[PDB]
Amino acid sequence: SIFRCRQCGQTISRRDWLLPMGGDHEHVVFNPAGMIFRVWCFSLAQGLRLIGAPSGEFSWFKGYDWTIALCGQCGSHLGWHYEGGSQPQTFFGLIKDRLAEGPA
Ligand SMILES: O=C1C[C@H](NC(=O)c2c(Cl)cc(Cl)cc2Cl)C(=O)N1
Ligand SMILES: [Zn+2]
């Protein structure tokens, strides 16, 4: 029902807020360092700290620029916030295995 940061327990998001971007909330992707991420898309999230300036470089989602999303509490890299696109303008792509699911 809710998703917390796996490292410290910070409240991050909810199952109800999963978003099927391109028909699926799950997207498996790699960055230029070859790191594989299983990214779940969410319409909304909280408890994050978004860092740096948005960048389109290597964006996995056409038309969106990303900013890195850290856990606001412990600093763990939890994913990205996506903006500058259309339908929707913004969303979060969070790394599934950095989250823990549990009761509200
Ligand atoms: O949509 C995205 C987000 C994802 N970005 C990254 O992994 C990334 C890059 Cl490329 C550079 C730095 Cl300095 C830090 C990070 Cl976290 C990517 O490659 N495509
Ligand atoms: Zn945390």
Automatic annotation (TrEMBL):
Binding locations of Ca(2+): D24, E26
Official protein name in the record: Cereblon isoform 4
Residue stretches spanning the membrane: none
Coiled-coil blocks: none
Protein's organism: Magnetospirillum gryphiswaldense
Binding site for Zn(2+): C5, C8, C71, C74
Top-rank taxon, per record: Bacteria
Domain spans labelled CULT: 1-103
Keywords assigned by UniProt, alphabetized: Calcium, Metal-binding, Zinc
GO MF annotations in UniProt: metal ion binding
